Write a protein that binds this ligand. Structure first.
Ligand SMILES: CCCCCCCC/C=C/CCCCCCCC(=O)OC[C@H](O)CO
Ligand SMILES: CCCCCCCC/C=C/CCCCCCCC(=O)OC[C@H](O)CO
Ligand SMILES: CCCCCCCC/C=C/CCCCCCCC(=O)OC[C@H](O)CO
Ligand SMILES: CCCCCCCC/C=C/CCCCCCCC(=O)OC[C@H](O)CO
Ligand SMILES: CCCCCCCC/C=C/CCCCCCCC(=O)OC[C@H](O)CO
Ligand SMILES: CCCCCCCC/C=C\CCCCCCCC(=O)OC[C@H](O)CO
Ligand SMILES: C=CCCCCCCCCCO[C@@H]1[C@@H](O)[C@@H](O)O[C@H](CO)[C@H]1O
Length: 469
C-alpha cells in the first residue's frame, strides 16, 4: 500500500546532499597537497618569515587535513543538541551556515594569504560534515517506509561516494586542481549547501519527530499519507504511538545513560563496534595510499587507476542498495568484512612477492579494487544507517551522537597511526586491518541482529527481552 512518491524521493535526495558534502570534503583535500604546501610556503615568506622546513610544512599540512576530522568528532557528537531542539529538517537547514562559512574561509584563504583561514575553514567544514553524518541517516531512517529503510539508508553512502568521486574528478589538474583554481576546488562546497538550503524548507519534518517528540499526531499522519502515497498508515501511526508511550515512560536519555542501561548497552556496543568495523577496515588508508601503491606496482597512470577505484566505490554502493533488503544487513556486512579480509591479506602477500614474481604486481592492483568493492557491499553503507535502526525515538539522537563520534574518532586514529605503523611493518601493515576485519566478522555473526523489515519497536523489545536475561 506504501509507494515511493516523488515527494519521498525529493526529501531523501535533498537530505543526501549533506552526504555528498561529507564525501566531497573527505576526498577533495588529497589531490592538491603539493599546490597547498607551496601556498603555505609562499605565505610564510610573503609575510617576511623564513621558508618552512620540510617538517614544519608537513606539520601544517597534516594539521590542514586532520583538523577536518577533529571538527567532525565534535560535530557528530553534537547532533543531540540540534535535532530535538530544532527538529531534523530544521537542523539540516541551520547548519548550512557552517558549510557556507567554512567554504568561504577556504575559498578566500589564498587571496587573504592566510594559512589560519585554511585551517579554520577545514575545522568549520569538519563541524558541518560531522553534524551531517548524524543528521542525514537520522532523517532518512525516520521518514522511510519500514520495508525500504535499509535501501533508502544506503542512499546516504551513495551520496558520500559520489561526493568522493566528484572530488577526485575536480581535483584533476586540468579541472580545478591547479595552482590558480584550487581555492575554488575547496570553495565548491558552498554550492551544494546553497542548493540544499533552498530545497530544505519544502521537505517535511520527520513525522516520527512530529508525532512522538511533539505529540502532533494529525500532522504526522498527513505527512505520512503524502510521503508514502496512501491514506492507510494506521500500522505505522500506531507503532509511533507505541514509541511515544515508551518515551514518556523512560527518563530523558543521556550519552552516559546508554552505557549504564542494559537495554541500551547492547545496541550501543553493537553501534560503536560496527563503526569501528567500517573505519578499522583500513578503507581510508587503502584509498588514500592506493595511488602510491598502484604506482609502485607499475601502473603507468596511477591517478586514473585511483579514479577507477572511486568508480568501483560507487558502482558497488549501488549494488548494496539493491541487495540490502533482500540479503539483510548481517549477510552484506559479513560478506564485505570477509572479502576485505581476503583482499588486505592479498595486498600484503602481493607486495611482499612482487619484486621476485612480477605477475604479483597485477594481483596487488586487483586486490585494491576488489577490496573497495567488498567494502561498499556492506561495511560502507550499513554502519551509517543501522544505528538509527537499533534504537527507538527517545535514545536515537544520543546514540547516533556517540556512534557517529566513534566513527570519526577511529578515522582520526587510523590517519594518525597508520603512517608510523606502515613505516615499521611495511607490507605487513595491512594484516593489522585483516585482524580487525576478522575480529569484527566474528562479532557481526554472533552479536548483530537482523534489522531488515522490522519496526524500531520490535528491535527495541527484543533488546529488552535479552536484557531480561
Ligand atoms: C605532483 C603530483 C601531485 C599528486 C599528489 C598525490 C595525490 C595524493 C593521493 C591521493 C589519493 C586519492 C584519494 C582521494 C579520494 C579518497 C579520499 C579518502 O578516502 O581519504 C581520506 C583522506 O585522504 C584522509 O587523509
Ligand atoms: C562538470 C560538472 C558541472 C557541475 C559543477 C557545478 C555544480 C553545481 C551544483 C552544485 C551542487 C552540488 C550538486 C548536488 C549533489 C547532490 C548529491 C546527491 O544527490 O547524490 C546522490 C544521492 O545518493 C541520491 O539520493
Ligand atoms: C575468507 C577469506 C580470508 C582468507 C585469507 C587467506 C589468504 C589467501 C591468500 C592467498 C595468496 C596466495 C597467492 C600465491 C600465488 C602464487 C604466487 C606465485 O607463485 O607467482 C608466480 C607468478 O608467475 C607471478 O609472476
Ligand atoms: C547474495 C550475496 C551477493 C553479494 C555480492 C558480492 C559482490 C562483492 C564483490 C565482488 C567482486 C568480485 C569478487 C570475486 C573476485 C573476482 C576478482 C576479479 O575478477 O576482478 C578482476 C580484477 O579487477 C583484475 O584487475
Ligand atoms: C582484537 C585483536 C585484533 C587486532 C588486530 C590483529 C593484530 C595482529 C597483527 C599483529 C602484527 C604483528 C606485530 C609484529 C611486531 C614487530 C614490529 C617490528 O619489530 O618491526 C621492526 C621493523 O622491521 C623495523 O624496520
Ligand atoms: C574471497 C572470498 C571471500 C568472500 C566471502 C567472505 C566470507 C564470509 C561471507 C559470507 C558469510 C556470511 C554470509 C552467509 C551467512 C549469513 C546468514 C546469517 O548469518 O544471517 C541470518 C540472519 O537471520 C539474516 O536474515
Ligand atoms: C588524522 C588524519 C585523518 C583525517 C581523515 C580525514 C577524512 C576523514 C573522513 C573519513 C570518511 O570515511 C568514509 C566512510 O565513513 C564511508 O562513508 O566510506 C567512505 C569511502 O567510500 C569513507 O571515505
Amino acid at each position: 500500500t506504501q509507494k515511493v512518491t516523488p515527494a519521498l524521493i525529493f526529501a531523501i535526495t535533498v537530505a543526501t546532499i549533506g552526504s555528498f558534502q561529507f564525501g566531497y570534503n573527505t576526498g577533495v583535500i588529497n589531490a592538491p597537497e603539493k599546490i597547498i604546501k607551496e601556498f603555505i610556503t609562499k605565505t610564510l615568506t610573503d609575510k617576511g618569515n623564513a621558508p618552512p622546513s620540510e617538517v614544519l610544512l608537513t606539520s601544517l599540512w597534516s594539521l590542514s587535513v586532520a583538523i577536518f576530522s577533529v571538527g567532525g568528532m565534535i560535530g557528530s557528537f553534537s547532533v543531540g543538541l540540534f535535532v530535538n531542539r530544532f527538529g531534523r529538517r530544521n537542523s539540516m537547514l541551520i547548519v548550512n551556515l557552517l558549510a557556507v562559512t567554512g567554504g568561504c574561509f577556504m575559498g578566500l584563504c589564498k587571496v587573504a594569504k592566510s594559512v589560519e583561514m585554511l585551517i579554520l575553514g577545514r575545522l568549520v567544514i569538519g563541524l558541518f560534515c560531522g553534524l551531517c553524518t548524524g543528521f542525514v541517516p537520522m532523517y532518512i531512517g525516520e521518514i522511510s517506509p519500514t520495508a525500504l529503510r535499509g535501501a533508502f539508508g544506503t542512499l546516504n553512502q551513495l551520496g558520500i561516494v559520489v561526493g568522493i568521486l566528484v572530488a577526485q574528478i575536480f581535483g584533476l589538474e586540468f579541472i580545478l586542481g591547479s595552482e590558480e583554481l584550487w581555492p575554488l576546488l575547496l570553495g565548491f562546497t558552498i554550492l551544494p549547501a546553497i542548493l540544499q538550503s533552498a530545497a530544505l524548507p519544502f521537505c517535511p519534518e520527520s513525522p516520527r519527530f512530529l508525532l512522538i517528540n511533539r505529540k502532533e499526531e494529525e500532522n504526522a499522519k498527513q505527512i505520512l499519507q503524502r510521503l508514502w502515497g496512501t491514506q492507510d498508515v494506521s500500522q505505522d501511526i500506531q507503532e509511533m504511538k507505541d514509541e511515544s508511550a515508551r518515551m514518556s515512560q523512560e527518563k530523558q536519555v543521556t550519552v552516559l545513560e546508554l552505557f549504564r542501561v542494559s537495554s541500551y548497552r547492547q545496541p550501543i556496543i553493537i553501534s560503536i563496534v560496527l563503526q569501528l568495523s567500517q573505519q578499522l577496515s583500513g578503507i581510508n588508508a587503502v584509498f588514500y595510499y592506493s595511488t602510491g601503491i598502484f604506482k609502485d606496482a607499475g601502473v603507468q597512470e596511477p591517478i586514473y587507476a585511483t579514479i577507477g577505484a572511486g568508480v568501483v566505490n560507487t558502482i558497488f554502493t549501488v549494488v548494496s542498495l539493491f541487495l540490502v533488503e533482500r540479503a539483510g544487513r548481517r549477510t552484506l556486512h559479513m560478506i564485505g568484512l570477509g572479502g576485505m579480509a581476503f583482499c588486505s591479506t592479498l595486498m600484503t602477500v602481493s607486495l611482499l612477492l612482487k619484486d621476485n614474481y612480477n605477475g604479483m604486481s597485477f594481483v596487488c592492483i586487483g586486490a585494491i579494487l576488489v577490496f573497495v568493492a567488498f567494502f561498499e557491499i556492506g561495511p560502507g553503507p550499513i554502519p551509517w544507517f543501522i544505528v538509527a535502526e537499533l534504537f527507538s525515538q527517545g535514545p536515537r539522537p544520543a546514540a547516533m551522537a556517540v556512534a557517529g563520534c566513534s566513527n570519526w574518532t577511529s578515522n582520526f586514529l587510523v590517519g594518525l597511526l597508520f603512517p608510523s605503523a606502515a613505516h615499521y611493518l611495511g607490507a605487513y601493515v595491512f594484516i593489522i586491518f585483516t585482524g580487525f576485519l576478522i575480529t569484527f566478522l566474528a562479532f557481526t555473526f554472533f552479536k548483530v541482529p537482523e534489522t531488515r523489515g522490522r519496526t524500531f519497536e520490535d528491535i527495541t523489545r527484543a533488546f529488552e527481552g535479552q536484557a531480561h536475561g
